[PDB]
Write an enzyme that holds these catalytic residues in place. Structure first.
Site, PDB file in Angstrom:
ATOM      1  CB  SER A   1      -3.502 -12.822  -2.120  1.00  0.00           C
ATOM      2  OG  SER A   1      -2.129 -12.705  -2.374  1.00  0.00           O
TER       3      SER A   1
ATOM      4  CD  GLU B   1      -5.350 -15.940  -8.583  1.00  0.00           C
ATOM      5  OE1 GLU B   1      -5.126 -14.946  -7.961  1.00  0.00           O
ATOM      6  OE2 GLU B   1      -5.765 -17.415  -8.017  1.00  0.00           O
TER       7      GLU B   1
ATOM      8  CG  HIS C   1      -4.524 -11.863  -6.863  1.00  0.00           C
ATOM      9  ND1 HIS C   1      -4.393 -12.878  -6.450  1.00  0.00           N
ATOM     10  CD2 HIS C   1      -3.751 -11.067  -6.165  1.00  0.00           C
ATOM     11  CE1 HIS C   1      -3.859 -13.118  -5.666  1.00  0.00           C
ATOM     12  NE2 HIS C   1      -3.563 -11.932  -4.631  1.00  0.00           N
TER      13      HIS C   1
HETATM   14  C1  LIG Z   1      -4.614  -5.404  -3.216  1.00  0.00           C
HETATM   15  N1  LIG Z   1      -3.675  -5.624  -4.542  1.00  0.00           N
HETATM   16  C2  LIG Z   1      -2.686  -6.095  -3.474  1.00  0.00           C
HETATM   17  O1  LIG Z   1      -2.262  -6.107  -2.442  1.00  0.00           O
HETATM   18  O2  LIG Z   1      -2.122  -7.240  -3.852  1.00  0.00           O
HETATM   19  C3  LIG Z   1      -0.635  -7.465  -3.992  1.00  0.00           C
HETATM   20  C4  LIG Z   1       0.454  -6.333  -3.756  1.00  0.00           C
HETATM   21  C5  LIG Z   1       1.739  -7.313  -4.442  1.00  0.00           C
HETATM   22  C6  LIG Z   1       1.638  -8.499  -3.752  1.00  0.00           C
HETATM   23  C7  LIG Z   1       2.394  -9.414  -3.700  1.00  0.00           C
HETATM   24  C8  LIG Z   1       3.403 -10.678  -3.064  1.00  0.00           C
HETATM   25  C9  LIG Z   1       1.969 -11.664  -3.519  1.00  0.00           C
HETATM   26  C10 LIG Z   1       1.274 -11.398  -3.966  1.00  0.00           C
HETATM   27  C11 LIG Z   1       0.470  -9.322  -3.870  1.00  0.00           C
HETATM   28  C12 LIG Z   1      -0.844  -8.956  -4.513  1.00  0.00           C
HETATM   29  C13 LIG Z   1      -3.890  -5.884  -5.947  1.00  0.00           C
HETATM   30  C14 LIG Z   1      -4.305  -4.919  -6.622  1.00  0.00           C
HETATM   31  C15 LIG Z   1      -4.383  -6.049  -8.118  1.00  0.00           C
HETATM   32  C16 LIG Z   1      -5.300  -6.794  -8.298  1.00  0.00           C
HETATM   33  N2  LIG Z   1      -6.379  -6.052  -6.151  1.00  0.00           N
HETATM   34  C17 LIG Z   1      -6.449  -4.923  -7.273  1.00  0.00           C
HETATM   35  C18 LIG Z   1      -4.638  -4.054  -6.683  1.00  0.00           C
HETATM   36  C19 LIG Z   1      -5.637  -6.409  -5.982  1.00  0.00           C
HETATM   37  C20 LIG Z   1      -5.958  -7.772  -4.964  1.00  0.00           C
HETATM   38  C21 LIG Z   1      -5.274  -8.004  -4.128  1.00  0.00           C
HETATM   39  C22 LIG Z   1      -6.946  -7.937  -2.455  1.00  0.00           C
HETATM   40  C23 LIG Z   1      -6.339  -8.364  -0.816  1.00  0.00           C
HETATM   41  C24 LIG Z   1      -5.237  -8.790  -0.845  1.00  0.00           C
HETATM   42  N3  LIG Z   1      -4.451  -8.664  -2.038  1.00  0.00           N
HETATM   43  C25 LIG Z   1      -4.904  -8.603  -3.486  1.00  0.00           C
END
Ligand SMILES: CN(C(=O)Oc1ccc2ccccc2c1)[C@@H]1C2CCN(CC2)[C@H]1Cc1cccnc1
Ligand SMILES: *[C@@H]1O[C@H](CO[C@@H]2O[C@@H](C)[C@@H](O)[C@@H](O)[C@@H]2O)[C@@H](O[C@@H]2O[C@H](CO)[C@@H](O)[C@H](O)[C@H]2NC(C)=O)[C@H](O)[C@H]1NC(C)=O
Ligand SMILES: *[C@@H]1O[C@H](CO[C@@H]2O[C@@H](C)[C@@H](O)[C@@H](O)[C@@H]2O)[C@@H](O[C@@H]2O[C@H](CO)[C@@H](O)[C@H](O)[C@H]2NC(C)=O)[C@H](O)[C@H]1NC(C)=O
Ligand SMILES: *[C@@H]1O[C@H](CO[C@@H]2O[C@@H](C)[C@@H](O)[C@@H](O)[C@@H]2O)[C@@H](O)[C@H](O)[C@H]1NC(C)=O
Ligand SMILES: *[C@@H]1O[C@H](CO)[C@@H](O)[C@H](O)[C@H]1NC(C)=O
Ligand SMILES: *[C@@H]1O[C@H](CO)[C@@H](O)[C@H](O)[C@H]1NC(C)=O
Ligand SMILES: *[C@@H]1O[C@H](CO)[C@@H](O)[C@H](O)[C@H]1NC(C)=O
Ligand code: NA
Length: 526
Positions: A195, A322, A435
């Site tokens: 991400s 995603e 995602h």
């Molecule tokens: C941790 N959580 C989160 O931080 O997701 C975001 C939040 C905001 C964003 C803004 C722009 C682009 C991407 C973004 C992603 C997401 C959120 C939704 C799906 N699972 C559970 C909760 C997580 C997946 C994940 C895990 C580690 C790092 N990333 C994402």
């Protein structure tokens, strides 16, 4: 065991993994703490120490706002930080195989979190399985997120922007100067991230100051050309000023603004970050990478288009669903606790939420392209259309366009499509292969048989861990021994990708071809 580094000695701990031993160094510091006059500045060099540093527990995670949209729900809370938040958070971790290797390939992990959140101490980021099973050295670092990491007054060295990226870059420098002392090869370093972490890895491909600090790169569900990944200088300045007004730090001398924000409590900055944007989406990145003139010398789309980047191999991929995760964070009719069947009017409302600053015609074009039903009598039609819109626009189509653009300059590129919804996940079935759902498979958690995973999942993770390791060691992500589907290079003509699942691994071509032609060609005009 004690290791002598350029700045001093450090002590580790031993870990029993799968009847063997991994040595872990949790919490080595790699920069002066960015406190006081150092807040908002590039990370400063770390001065030596004469004692033994105890790298025996994870250090503080960086300041950030916690996700509390589902208190007590493991599906969200497993991503919340699991150590103390603090501005003193520039630390990294090292997992080396035991016995000490002699010249091991290094994998460096960069977590995501929308550039506002995340931490390297999360359970799913534990490098010990990769070190045990494949004999690679794993490194991960904390880097500053949100406004503390990406507040930008372009030009001004008191807040130049991209501090979190320079944190990452200084940790890669630490690996160059120190990892041989751990038995690693500084000449065989693969960055991987997910991400915002993947977006960060792609920006290290662009930044000249990073080109000599790593060999190859792995991009999981993320790249710098995603609509959320880079903030304009316009928005960066406006948002920095909106934050100064929100904290009563509005001044005329811009340096006196930065000095005023330095005397605010970490919390008071965190609380106002959310309101520097007029209209926000679940995918807002209030404070993120910008074109600072230092780490990024030009708008990254121009550098991609014109071939200005490190020439090396890349591994890129995306998950089948995603977009779904973000729908329950604000789209009307959606809930993690019911099958979220939405009407046409609810779909149109959903577009307003994810596409606020888009024109009326813009929203109509998305509607038109994505609701030409093959069978309009399916009640999940609109539910799935909105997930696909969010996923294709924000992740899948930018990942493919980056890979096409990158391979057109002569380099080998491998693309995957991860489509296993794992057995034990707490989010409901309609959200599919979400995602972030591949991270545990990359890190080898299903290799732990006590961890309530199926046998098919252990096999999938074992093959993925092998392919990732072979990519880092040899530039080629094959599983050469167990009669596996070969993974062909992705060329711009044929666009072959590999699918990852517990059933049949398949070669397919031209993922999302019609959808991405809409997003990548038609839509940006509007
Ligand atoms: C941790 N959580 C989160 O931080 O997701 C975001 C939040 C905001 C964003 C803004 C722009 C682009 C991407 C973004 C992603 C997401 C959120 C939704 C799906 N699972 C559970 C909760 C997580 C997946 C994940 C895990 C580690 C790092 N990333 C994402
Ligand atoms: C550790 O190995 C390196 C070479 O690593 C390999 O080659 C890289 C170019 C890259 O493709 C990696 O993935 C490979 O695994 C050795 O580097 C040599 O160092 C000597 C110095 O004595 C130098 O003269 C040679 O040119 C280097 N060889 C290269 C660049 O291929 C390094 O010495 C090894 N160190 C130990 C302690 O084993
Ligand atoms: C699925 O639930 C959504 C969300 O509603 C909330 O969560 C549910 C699980 C339950 O606890 C509800 O009481 C909660 O409100 C439903 O959308 C809501 O619909 C009501 C009318 O019934 C409306 O007043 C609310 O504004 C809606 N909330 C949102 C966020 O849109 C939805 O109807 C449910 N869908 C299905 C197919 O059952
Ligand atoms: C750093 O750690 C030193 C030794 O730690 C202790 O002994 C080893 C063998 C392990 O069993 C470990 O878990 C023990 O805690 C301490 O003697 C030293 O004081 C520590 N330094 C600090 C706390 O600044
Ligand atoms: C910043 O953006 C907000 C929202 O668009 C707007 O009201 C404001 O005029 C912009 N400029 C300044 C200097 O605050
Ligand atoms: C702004 O403040 C800095 C720091 O004290 C100072 O060097 C500079 O002269 C000031 N400029 C203006 C226009 O006030
Ligand atoms: C290959 O197959 C054997 C069983 O035949 C299995 O134990 C092993 O872990 C597999 N290796 C990989 C790299 O998938
Ligand atoms: Na074809």
């Amino acid at each position: 065991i004690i290791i002598a580094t350029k700045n001093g000695k450090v002590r580790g701990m031993q870990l029993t993994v799968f009847g063997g031993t991994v040595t872990a160094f949790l919490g080595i510091p790699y920069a002066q703490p960015p406190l006081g006059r150092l807040r908002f500045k590039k990370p400063q060099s770390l001065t030596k120490w004469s004692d033994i540093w105890n790298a025996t527990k994870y250090a503080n995670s960086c300041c950030q706002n916690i996700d509390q949209s589902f208190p007590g729900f493991h599906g969200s809370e497993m991503w919340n930080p699991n150590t103390d938040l603090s501005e003193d958070c520039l630390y990294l971790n090292v997992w080396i195989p035991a016995p000490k290797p002699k010249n091991a390939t290094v994998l460096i992990w960069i977590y995501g979190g929308g550039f506002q959140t995340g931490t390297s101490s999360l359970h799913v980021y534990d490098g010990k399985f990769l070190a045990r099973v494949e004999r690679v050295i794993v490194v991960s670092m904390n880097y500053r997120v949100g406004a503390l990491g990406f507040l930008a007054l372009p030009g001004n060295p008191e807040a130049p922007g991209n501090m979190g990226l320079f944190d990452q870059q200084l940790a890669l420098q630490w690996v160059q100067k120190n990892i041989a002392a751990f038995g690693g090869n500084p000449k065989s370093v693969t960055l991987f991230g997910e991400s915002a972490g993947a977006a960060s890895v792609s920006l290290h491909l662009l930044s000249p100051g990073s080109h000599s600090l790593f060999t190859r790169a792995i991009l999981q569900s993320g790249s710098f050309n995603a609509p959320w990944a880079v903030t304009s200088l316009y928005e960066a300045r406006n948002r920095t000023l909106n934050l100064a007004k929100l904290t009563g730090c509005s001044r005329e001398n811009e340096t006196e603004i930065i000095k005023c924000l330095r005397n605010k409590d970490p919390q008071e900055i965190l609380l106002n970050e959310a309101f520097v944007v007029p209209y926000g989406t679940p995918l807002s990145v209030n404070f993120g990478p910008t074109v600072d003139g230092d780490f990024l010398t030009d708008m990254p789309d121009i550098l991609l288009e014109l071939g200005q980047f490190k020439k090396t191999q890349i591994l890129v991929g995306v998950n089948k669903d995603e977009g779904t995760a973000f729908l329950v964070y604000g789209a009307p009719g959606f809930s993690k606790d019911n099958n979220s069947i939405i009407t046409r009017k609810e779909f149109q409302e959903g577009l307003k939420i994810f596409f606020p600053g888009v024109s009326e015609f813009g929203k109509e074009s998305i509607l038109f392209h994505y609701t030409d039903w093959v069978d309009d009598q399916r009640p999940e039609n609109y539910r799935e259309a909105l997930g696909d819109v969010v996923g294709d626009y924000n992740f899948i189509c930018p990942a493919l366009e980056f890979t096409k653009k990158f391979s057109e300059w002569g380099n080998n590129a491998f693309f995957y499509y991860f489509e296993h919804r794992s057995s034990k996940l707490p989010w409901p079935e309609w959200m599919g292969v979400m995602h972030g759902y591949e991270i545990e498979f990359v890190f080898g958690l299903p290799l732990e048989r006590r961890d309530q995973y199926t046998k098919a999942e252990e096999i999938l993770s074992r093959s993925i861990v092998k392919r990732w390791a072979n990519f880092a060691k040899y530039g080629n992500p094959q599983e050469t021994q167990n009669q596996s589907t070969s993974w062909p290079v992705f060329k711009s003509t044929e666009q072959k990708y590999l699918t990852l699942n517990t059933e049949s691994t398949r070669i397919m071509t031209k993922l999302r071809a019609q959808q991405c032609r809409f997003w990548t060609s038609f839509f940006p005009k509007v």
